[PDB]
Amino acid sequence: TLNGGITDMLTELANFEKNVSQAIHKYNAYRKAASVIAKYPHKIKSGAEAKKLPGVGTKIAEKIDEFLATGKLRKLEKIRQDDTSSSINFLTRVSGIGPSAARKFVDEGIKTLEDLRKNEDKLNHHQRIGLKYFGDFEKRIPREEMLQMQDIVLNEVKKVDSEYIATVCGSFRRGAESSGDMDVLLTHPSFTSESTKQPKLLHQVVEQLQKVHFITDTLSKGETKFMGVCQLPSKNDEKEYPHRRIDIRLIPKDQYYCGVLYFTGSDIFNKNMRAHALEKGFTINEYTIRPLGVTGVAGEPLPVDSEKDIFDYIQWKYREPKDRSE
DNA sequence: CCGACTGCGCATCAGC
DNA sequence: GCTGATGCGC
DNA sequence: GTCGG
Ligand SMILES: Nc1ncnc2c1ncn2[C@@H]1C[C@@H](O)[C@@H](COP(=O)(O)OP(=O)(O)[C@@](F)(Cl)P(=O)(O)O)O1
Ligand SMILES: [Cl-]
Ligand SMILES: [Mg+2]
Ligand code: NA
Ligand code: NA
Ligand code: NA
């Protein structure tokens, strides 16, 4: 990419602040600056030119100047040499091991992949599955495999109840040629904001996908959100496909547009769009857009009949999913 | 200067 | 058990 | 770490 070196550096800084410093706002600030620089359609020549962008301030401008002059950042070179930071950054790459658990594991002398595998009884369920598929979960998914996965999910859901609608969202819906995981939005006319007329709506879909050996593991599962593991079937004498992360979110059918806007993302795009909504006097989540009163209490959900209606309330021109990869 | 920073489901834990 | 806070990942 | 008022 055009400024890949700078955005890589800012992302590494973001990950340091989240994982090691446990400084969530610095993490988000670095991600915001990386995102704004990644969309900028010029090869940046100086930190002063970058500082013109929203989210880039004095400190990041100085780092950009160092990086442009030298190709490196001394701050990051030292972080990369710190064993505790190195150990924590590694451990958090396992799904279910966050900043707190990683630091605690290092305290206890659990610092490597070998240590983790030798101490599975110290891991909770999520962490245990994250360790099992550590290698697979770092592989990306070609869009061609996403289409095969889409075809299984939609057809198996149809077999359970033809009134379900499953929608693959995430980067897939934004048109990307590869995805990190699969995100599935699910609706059923029995589940609305007014009532739940049928139980086990998500459970029945999950069990059917398990029945056919598509879903292989469960990280967490409640009434509306499933997070787990899946795998495409392979052919005779073929190597097996990697196991893949899959999330399924059951959303009330009358709130589909807020749900699909949310599950399409990107995460930064949602963050930016919700921040803008607040400046316009609205709050947006995956269910509703609501006005904010004088006191800041959210009012009643506003009528929504398309994704564009949401954009219209906050006076943004509509952006197709392909243009939401921030 | 400095308060605020997008918004939330599920797992886990502490206190009662 | 409930309720609330925290961790985690979305 | 950045920024709006
Ligand atoms: N912190 C967040 N705040 C608001 N919305 C959020 C947040 N995290 C994830 N979301 C999102 C948006 C959407 O992409 C969805 C999917 O979450 P995701 O982590 O799978 O992101 P993605 O866009 O699908 C991807 F490009 Cl990273 P991937 O294809 O590699 O997986 O839920
Ligand atoms: Cl912070
Ligand atoms: Mg995804
Ligand atoms: Na700026
Ligand atoms: Na992790
Ligand atoms: Na996901």
Tab-separated table of C-alpha atoms (C1' of nucleotides) and ligand atoms in Angstrom:
chain	number	residue	atom	x	y	z
A	1	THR	CA	0.000	0.000	0.000
A	2	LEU	CA	0.907	3.673	-0.414
A	3	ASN	CA	1.967	4.377	3.186
A	4	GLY	CA	2.233	0.770	4.370
A	5	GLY	CA	5.370	1.337	6.428
A	6	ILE	CA	3.758	4.102	8.496
A	7	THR	CA	0.445	2.311	9.005
A	8	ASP	CA	2.300	-0.877	9.981
A	9	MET	CA	4.267	1.128	12.582
A	10	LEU	CA	1.114	2.724	13.978
A	11	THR	CA	-0.629	-0.649	14.165
A	12	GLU	CA	2.287	-2.173	16.078
A	13	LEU	CA	2.138	0.781	18.485
A	14	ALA	CA	-1.626	0.268	18.842
A	15	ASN	CA	-1.129	-3.402	19.656
A	16	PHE	CA	1.578	-2.524	22.213
A	17	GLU	CA	-0.690	-0.073	24.026
A	18	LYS	CA	-3.624	-2.510	24.085
A	19	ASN	CA	-1.714	-5.683	24.937
A	20	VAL	CA	1.157	-4.471	27.147
A	21	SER	CA	0.227	-1.041	28.476
A	22	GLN	CA	-3.476	-1.973	28.688
A	23	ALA	CA	-4.189	1.575	27.510
A	24	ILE	CA	-7.365	1.188	25.458
A	25	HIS	CA	-7.705	4.824	24.387
A	26	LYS	CA	-4.136	5.009	23.070
A	27	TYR	CA	-4.826	1.761	21.234
A	28	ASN	CA	-7.893	3.318	19.605
A	29	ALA	CA	-6.025	6.545	18.833
A	30	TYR	CA	-3.240	4.692	17.030
A	31	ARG	CA	-5.804	2.667	15.062
A	32	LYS	CA	-7.656	5.837	14.118
A	33	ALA	CA	-4.459	7.452	12.833
A	34	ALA	CA	-3.426	4.305	10.965
A	35	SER	CA	-6.869	4.158	9.339
A	36	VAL	CA	-6.886	7.816	8.288
A	37	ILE	CA	-3.381	7.493	6.833
A	38	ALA	CA	-4.278	4.276	5.007
A	39	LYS	CA	-7.057	6.003	3.034
A	40	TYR	CA	-4.921	9.084	2.235
A	41	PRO	CA	-4.281	8.990	-1.552
A	42	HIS	CA	-0.717	10.371	-1.464
A	43	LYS	CA	2.614	8.931	-0.392
A	44	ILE	CA	3.274	10.906	2.787
A	45	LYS	CA	6.417	13.063	2.690
A	46	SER	CA	6.549	14.410	6.260
A	47	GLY	CA	4.924	14.265	9.665
A	48	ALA	CA	3.601	17.787	9.140
A	49	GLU	CA	1.688	16.614	6.057
A	50	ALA	CA	0.222	13.720	8.044
A	51	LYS	CA	-0.712	15.969	10.988
A	52	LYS	CA	-3.230	17.680	8.672
A	53	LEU	CA	-5.292	14.482	8.921
A	54	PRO	CA	-7.866	14.053	11.720
A	55	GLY	CA	-6.512	11.702	14.376
A	56	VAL	CA	-2.848	12.441	13.657
A	57	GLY	CA	-1.419	14.820	16.248
A	58	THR	CA	1.976	16.114	17.359
A	59	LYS	CA	3.339	12.832	18.759
A	60	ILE	CA	2.436	10.694	15.747
A	61	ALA	CA	3.749	13.363	13.380
A	62	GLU	CA	7.133	13.202	15.136
A	63	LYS	CA	7.198	9.404	14.857
A	64	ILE	CA	6.358	9.642	11.158
A	65	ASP	CA	9.320	12.012	10.690
A	66	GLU	CA	11.669	9.566	12.441
A	67	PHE	CA	10.319	6.657	10.408
A	68	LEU	CA	10.632	8.540	7.121
A	69	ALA	CA	14.195	9.620	7.928
A	70	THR	CA	15.465	6.260	9.177
A	71	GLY	CA	13.045	3.491	8.183
A	72	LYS	CA	12.569	2.521	11.837
A	73	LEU	CA	11.240	3.767	15.160
A	74	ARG	CA	13.583	3.489	18.153
A	75	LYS	CA	10.564	3.179	20.458
A	76	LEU	CA	9.428	0.078	18.585
A	77	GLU	CA	12.952	-1.353	18.241
A	78	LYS	CA	13.247	-1.277	22.023
A	79	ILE	CA	9.768	-2.735	22.545
A	80	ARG	CA	10.681	-5.603	20.199
A	81	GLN	CA	13.692	-6.389	22.429
A	82	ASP	CA	11.777	-6.344	25.734
A	83	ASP	CA	11.104	-9.971	26.695
A	84	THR	CA	8.004	-9.218	28.776
A	85	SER	CA	6.431	-7.155	25.993
A	86	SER	CA	7.435	-9.853	23.492
A	87	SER	CA	5.923	-12.610	25.630
A	88	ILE	CA	2.662	-10.734	26.247
A	89	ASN	CA	2.245	-9.769	22.587
A	90	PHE	CA	2.697	-13.416	21.613
A	91	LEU	CA	0.277	-14.852	24.183
A	92	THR	CA	-2.511	-12.450	23.182
A	93	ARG	CA	-2.427	-13.892	19.662
A	94	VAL	CA	-4.285	-16.915	21.089
A	95	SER	CA	-8.041	-16.305	20.934
A	96	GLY	CA	-9.362	-15.944	24.482
A	97	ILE	CA	-6.027	-14.744	25.910
A	98	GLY	CA	-6.329	-10.992	26.335
A	99	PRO	CA	-4.013	-8.417	27.914
A	100	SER	CA	-4.790	-9.409	31.505
A	101	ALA	CA	-4.516	-13.192	31.093
A	102	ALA	CA	-1.326	-12.883	29.020
A	103	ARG	CA	0.423	-10.848	31.722
A	104	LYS	CA	-0.745	-13.275	34.411
A	105	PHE	CA	0.500	-16.255	32.368
A	106	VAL	CA	3.920	-14.603	32.048
A	107	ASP	CA	3.941	-14.041	35.827
A	108	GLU	CA	3.374	-17.794	36.231
A	109	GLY	CA	6.150	-18.656	33.756
A	110	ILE	CA	3.817	-19.621	30.896
A	111	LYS	CA	5.355	-17.688	28.000
A	112	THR	CA	5.602	-19.879	24.883
A	113	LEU	CA	3.442	-22.062	22.693
A	114	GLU	CA	5.132	-25.077	24.316
A	115	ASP	CA	4.228	-23.744	27.773
A	116	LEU	CA	0.606	-23.276	26.743
A	117	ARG	CA	0.378	-26.799	25.320
A	118	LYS	CA	1.949	-28.217	28.496
A	119	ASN	CA	-0.593	-26.301	30.657
A	120	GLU	CA	-3.957	-26.810	28.927
A	121	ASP	CA	-5.642	-27.343	32.295
A	122	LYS	CA	-4.841	-23.707	33.165
A	123	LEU	CA	-6.832	-22.457	30.143
A	124	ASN	CA	-10.558	-21.766	30.066
A	125	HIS	CA	-12.648	-23.309	27.275
A	126	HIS	CA	-12.239	-20.408	24.829
A	127	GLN	CA	-8.460	-20.296	25.353
A	128	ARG	CA	-8.186	-24.071	24.968
A	129	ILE	CA	-9.865	-23.936	21.543
A	130	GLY	CA	-7.831	-20.872	20.549
A	131	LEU	CA	-4.666	-22.797	21.352
A	132	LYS	CA	-5.825	-25.903	19.451
A	133	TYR	CA	-6.319	-23.872	16.259
A	134	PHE	CA	-3.574	-21.313	16.862
A	135	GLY	CA	-2.006	-21.926	13.466
A	136	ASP	CA	-5.250	-22.233	11.502
A	137	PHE	CA	-6.672	-19.004	12.945
A	138	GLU	CA	-3.788	-16.951	11.543
A	139	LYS	CA	-4.557	-18.133	8.005
A	140	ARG	CA	-6.806	-15.996	5.855
A	141	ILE	CA	-9.821	-17.318	3.942
A	142	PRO	CA	-9.882	-16.921	0.138
A	143	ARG	CA	-13.149	-15.452	-1.115
A	144	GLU	CA	-13.599	-18.671	-3.117
A	145	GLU	CA	-13.740	-20.609	0.169
A	146	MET	CA	-16.029	-17.944	1.651
A	147	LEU	CA	-18.481	-18.635	-1.195
A	148	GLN	CA	-18.398	-22.380	-0.486
A	149	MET	CA	-18.918	-21.642	3.216
A	150	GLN	CA	-21.787	-19.267	2.398
A	151	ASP	CA	-23.454	-21.962	0.302
A	152	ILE	CA	-23.348	-24.502	3.158
A	153	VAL	CA	-24.597	-22.055	5.795
A	154	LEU	CA	-27.463	-20.711	3.688
A	155	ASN	CA	-28.590	-24.144	2.522
A	156	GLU	CA	-28.420	-25.738	5.975
A	157	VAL	CA	-30.302	-22.834	7.522
A	158	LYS	CA	-32.945	-23.259	4.801
A	159	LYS	CA	-33.303	-26.938	5.737
A	160	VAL	CA	-34.085	-26.012	9.358
A	161	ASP	CA	-36.723	-23.407	8.480
A	162	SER	CA	-37.182	-21.754	5.095
A	163	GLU	CA	-38.181	-18.480	6.811
A	164	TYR	CA	-34.670	-17.916	8.170
A	165	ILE	CA	-32.532	-15.398	6.324
A	166	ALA	CA	-28.758	-15.724	6.783
A	167	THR	CA	-26.522	-12.924	5.477
A	168	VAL	CA	-22.721	-13.115	5.334
A	169	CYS	CA	-21.351	-9.751	6.418
A	170	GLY	CA	-17.905	-8.595	7.463
A	171	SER	CA	-15.276	-7.948	4.805
A	172	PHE	CA	-17.001	-10.530	2.576
A	173	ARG	CA	-20.013	-8.240	2.173
A	174	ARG	CA	-17.566	-5.367	1.563
A	175	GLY	CA	-16.276	-7.306	-1.460
A	176	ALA	CA	-12.837	-8.308	-0.128
A	177	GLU	CA	-10.914	-11.080	-1.930
A	178	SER	CA	-10.060	-12.669	1.431
A	179	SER	CA	-11.452	-12.606	4.968
A	180	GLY	CA	-10.102	-13.376	8.417
A	181	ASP	CA	-13.310	-15.179	9.501
A	182	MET	CA	-16.996	-15.542	8.538
A	183	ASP	CA	-19.695	-13.309	10.026
A	184	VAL	CA	-23.310	-14.449	9.599
A	185	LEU	CA	-26.322	-12.272	10.383
A	186	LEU	CA	-29.435	-14.335	11.070
A	187	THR	CA	-33.105	-13.339	11.191
A	188	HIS	CA	-36.345	-15.258	11.592
A	189	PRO	CA	-39.816	-13.663	11.518
A	190	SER	CA	-40.559	-15.230	14.932
A	191	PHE	CA	-37.955	-13.011	16.636
A	192	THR	CA	-38.762	-9.293	16.572
A	193	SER	CA	-38.252	-6.339	18.877
A	194	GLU	CA	-41.843	-6.934	20.038
A	195	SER	CA	-41.702	-10.632	20.953
A	196	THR	CA	-39.862	-13.942	20.710
A	197	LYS	CA	-42.539	-16.361	19.511
A	198	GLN	CA	-40.233	-19.340	19.095
A	199	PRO	CA	-37.386	-20.532	21.358
A	200	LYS	CA	-34.027	-22.048	20.373
A	201	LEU	CA	-33.929	-20.086	17.093
A	202	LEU	CA	-30.125	-19.784	17.142
A	203	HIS	CA	-29.573	-23.154	18.831
A	204	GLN	CA	-31.413	-25.074	16.078
A	205	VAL	CA	-29.244	-23.493	13.392
A	206	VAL	CA	-26.074	-24.203	15.372
A	207	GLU	CA	-27.006	-27.863	15.951
A	208	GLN	CA	-27.823	-28.395	12.256
A	209	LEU	CA	-24.458	-26.947	11.241
A	210	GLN	CA	-22.882	-29.286	13.826
A	211	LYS	CA	-24.957	-32.236	12.594
A	212	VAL	CA	-23.365	-31.893	9.128
A	213	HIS	CA	-19.890	-31.393	10.673
A	214	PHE	CA	-19.536	-27.812	9.470
A	215	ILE	CA	-19.395	-26.356	12.991
A	216	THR	CA	-16.686	-28.213	14.938
A	217	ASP	CA	-16.147	-26.205	18.136
A	218	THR	CA	-17.932	-23.609	20.273
A	219	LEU	CA	-16.160	-20.657	21.892
A	220	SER	CA	-19.284	-19.078	23.378
A	221	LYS	CA	-22.998	-19.400	22.749
A	222	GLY	CA	-26.009	-17.520	24.066
A	223	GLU	CA	-29.532	-16.763	22.877
A	224	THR	CA	-28.447	-14.304	20.172
A	225	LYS	CA	-24.665	-14.667	19.611
A	226	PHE	CA	-22.662	-17.755	18.641
A	227	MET	CA	-18.873	-17.758	18.313
A	228	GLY	CA	-17.152	-20.899	17.207
A	229	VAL	CA	-15.150	-22.879	14.715
A	230	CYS	CA	-16.061	-24.377	11.357
A	231	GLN	CA	-14.430	-26.331	8.532
A	232	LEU	CA	-15.222	-26.953	4.879
A	233	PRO	CA	-15.440	-30.595	3.783
A	234	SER	CA	-12.538	-31.859	1.694
A	235	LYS	CA	-12.547	-34.372	-1.166
A	236	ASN	CA	-11.013	-37.859	-1.365
A	237	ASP	CA	-7.223	-37.815	-0.794
A	238	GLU	CA	-7.325	-34.016	-0.371
A	239	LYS	CA	-5.565	-32.193	2.440
A	240	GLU	CA	-8.113	-30.836	4.874
A	241	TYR	CA	-9.037	-27.172	4.884
A	242	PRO	CA	-7.930	-25.070	7.860
A	243	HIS	CA	-10.439	-24.631	10.627
A	244	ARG	CA	-12.073	-21.193	10.528
A	245	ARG	CA	-13.651	-18.788	12.988
A	246	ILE	CA	-17.386	-18.248	12.507
A	247	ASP	CA	-19.672	-15.827	14.354
A	248	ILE	CA	-23.464	-15.964	14.051
A	249	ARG	CA	-25.609	-13.095	15.342
A	250	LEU	CA	-29.392	-13.467	15.586
A	251	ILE	CA	-30.995	-10.017	15.228
A	252	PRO	CA	-34.699	-9.051	15.476
A	253	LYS	CA	-36.121	-9.124	11.975
A	254	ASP	CA	-37.503	-5.568	12.149
A	255	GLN	CA	-33.991	-4.336	13.113
A	256	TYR	CA	-32.218	-5.984	10.155
A	257	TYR	CA	-30.843	-2.760	8.676
A	258	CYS	CA	-29.182	-1.633	11.890
A	259	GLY	CA	-27.862	-5.168	12.311
A	260	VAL	CA	-26.476	-5.515	8.793
A	261	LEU	CA	-24.939	-2.041	8.961
A	262	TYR	CA	-23.196	-3.066	12.197
A	263	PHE	CA	-22.085	-6.550	11.071
A	264	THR	CA	-20.806	-5.191	7.735
A	265	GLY	CA	-18.389	-2.772	9.408
A	266	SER	CA	-15.509	-2.265	9.283
A	267	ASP	CA	-15.053	-1.884	13.038
A	268	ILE	CA	-13.321	1.473	12.520
A	269	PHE	CA	-16.067	2.514	10.101
A	270	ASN	CA	-18.704	1.757	12.743
A	271	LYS	CA	-16.643	3.694	15.305
A	272	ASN	CA	-16.355	6.682	12.954
A	273	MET	CA	-20.034	6.531	11.949
A	274	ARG	CA	-21.255	6.255	15.546
A	275	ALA	CA	-18.948	9.112	16.583
A	276	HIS	CA	-20.471	11.231	13.800
A	277	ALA	CA	-23.985	10.196	14.885
A	278	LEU	CA	-23.229	11.508	18.374
A	279	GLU	CA	-22.109	14.863	16.972
A	280	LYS	CA	-25.425	14.969	15.083
A	281	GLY	CA	-27.429	14.140	18.219
A	282	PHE	CA	-28.066	10.436	17.602
A	283	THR	CA	-26.773	7.150	18.971
A	284	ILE	CA	-26.400	4.084	16.749
A	285	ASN	CA	-26.068	0.456	17.789
A	286	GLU	CA	-26.763	-2.843	15.990
A	287	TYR	CA	-30.487	-2.607	16.869
A	288	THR	CA	-31.601	1.014	16.545
A	289	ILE	CA	-30.764	4.615	15.859
A	290	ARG	CA	-32.162	6.849	18.588
A	291	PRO	CA	-32.104	10.613	19.144
A	292	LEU	CA	-30.195	11.941	22.133
A	293	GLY	CA	-32.233	14.270	24.334
A	294	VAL	CA	-31.012	17.444	26.025
A	295	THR	CA	-29.829	15.338	28.984
A	296	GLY	CA	-28.098	12.749	26.822
A	297	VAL	CA	-30.672	10.021	27.462
A	298	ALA	CA	-31.371	8.080	24.286
A	299	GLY	CA	-34.908	8.550	23.019
A	300	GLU	CA	-37.143	6.164	21.113
A	301	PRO	CA	-35.892	4.234	18.068
A	302	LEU	CA	-36.455	6.050	14.798
A	303	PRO	CA	-38.079	4.389	11.759
A	304	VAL	CA	-35.508	2.619	9.570
A	305	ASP	CA	-36.380	1.076	6.208
A	306	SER	CA	-32.924	0.689	4.651
A	307	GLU	CA	-29.256	1.109	5.400
A	308	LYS	CA	-29.430	4.481	3.652
A	309	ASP	CA	-32.101	5.729	6.068
A	310	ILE	CA	-29.467	5.444	8.808
A	311	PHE	CA	-26.968	7.484	6.777
A	312	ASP	CA	-29.701	10.053	6.061
A	313	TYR	CA	-30.449	10.681	9.754
A	314	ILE	CA	-26.833	11.666	10.399
A	315	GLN	CA	-26.515	13.596	7.109
A	316	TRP	CA	-23.846	11.396	5.556
A	317	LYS	CA	-24.038	10.538	1.887
A	318	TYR	CA	-24.590	6.817	1.419
A	319	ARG	CA	-21.547	4.580	1.222
A	320	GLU	CA	-21.773	1.137	-0.345
A	321	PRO	CA	-20.189	-1.671	1.728
A	322	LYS	CA	-17.126	-1.690	-0.569
A	323	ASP	CA	-16.336	1.857	0.572
A	324	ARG	CA	-16.596	1.059	4.298
A	325	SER	CA	-13.212	-0.688	4.693
A	326	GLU	CA	-11.667	1.774	7.117
B	1	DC	C1'	-6.845	23.174	29.138
B	2	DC	C1'	-9.413	18.625	29.825
B	3	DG	C1'	-13.381	15.681	29.581
B	4	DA	C1'	-14.599	12.306	26.373
B	5	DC	C1'	-13.341	8.957	23.429
B	6	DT	C1'	-18.789	3.509	19.581
B	7	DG	C1'	-21.389	0.120	21.506
B	8	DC	C1'	-22.365	-4.603	23.375
B	9	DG	C1'	-23.014	-10.321	24.055
B	10	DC	C1'	-21.102	-14.064	26.623
B	11	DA	C1'	-17.883	-16.059	30.134
B	12	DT	C1'	-16.092	-15.543	34.568
B	13	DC	C1'	-15.607	-13.864	39.131
B	14	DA	C1'	-16.669	-11.489	43.715
B	15	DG	C1'	-19.887	-10.147	47.107
B	16	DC	C1'	-24.196	-11.010	49.222
C	1	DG	C1'	-28.979	-18.004	43.051
C	2	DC	C1'	-28.850	-12.770	41.727
C	3	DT	C1'	-26.401	-8.573	40.565
C	4	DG	C1'	-22.644	-6.040	39.073
C	5	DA	C1'	-17.867	-5.568	37.519
C	6	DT	C1'	-14.254	-7.172	34.521
C	7	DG	C1'	-12.214	-9.642	30.552
C	8	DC	C1'	-12.549	-10.600	25.873
C	9	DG	C1'	-13.656	-10.203	21.207
C	10	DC	C1'	-16.916	-8.718	18.204
D	1	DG	C1'	-2.898	10.097	21.703
D	2	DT	C1'	-6.000	13.385	19.808
D	3	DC	C1'	-9.265	16.919	19.848
D	4	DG	C1'	-13.378	20.314	20.399
D	5	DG	C1'	-15.083	24.130	22.699
E	1	LIG	N1	-15.237	-2.862	18.260
E	1	LIG	C1	-16.293	-2.804	17.328
E	1	LIG	N2	-17.220	-1.824	17.276
E	1	LIG	C2	-18.193	-1.832	16.363
E	1	LIG	N3	-18.326	-2.795	15.438
E	1	LIG	C3	-17.425	-3.835	15.429
E	1	LIG	C4	-16.384	-3.842	16.381
E	1	LIG	N4	-15.611	-4.947	16.194
E	1	LIG	C5	-16.124	-5.589	15.169
E	1	LIG	N5	-17.219	-4.976	14.723
E	1	LIG	C6	-17.735	-5.506	13.611
E	1	LIG	C7	-18.031	-4.648	12.417
E	1	LIG	C8	-18.102	-5.616	11.542
E	1	LIG	O1	-16.935	-5.751	10.611
E	1	LIG	C9	-18.375	-7.012	12.354
E	1	LIG	C10	-17.277	-8.116	12.097
E	1	LIG	O2	-16.149	-8.164	12.982
E	1	LIG	P1	-14.734	-8.697	12.416
E	1	LIG	O3	-13.735	-8.652	13.491
E	1	LIG	O4	-14.836	-10.109	11.882
E	1	LIG	O5	-14.276	-7.668	11.274
E	1	LIG	P2	-14.331	-7.873	9.685
E	1	LIG	O6	-14.777	-6.521	9.107
E	1	LIG	O7	-15.315	-8.983	9.279
E	1	LIG	C11	-12.644	-8.186	9.058
E	1	LIG	F1	-12.342	-7.358	8.006
E	1	LIG	CL1	-11.538	-7.769	10.313
E	1	LIG	P3	-12.387	-9.937	8.645
E	1	LIG	O8	-13.087	-10.258	7.331
E	1	LIG	O9	-10.935	-10.162	8.503
E	1	LIG	O10	-12.965	-10.780	9.764
E	1	LIG	O11	-18.621	-6.720	13.566
E	2	CL	CL	-5.500	4.942	27.487
E	3	MG	MG	-15.109	-10.937	10.038
E	4	NA	NA	-4.372	16.074	12.836
E	5	NA	NA	-6.189	-13.088	22.198
E	6	NA	NA	-15.930	-12.173	13.252
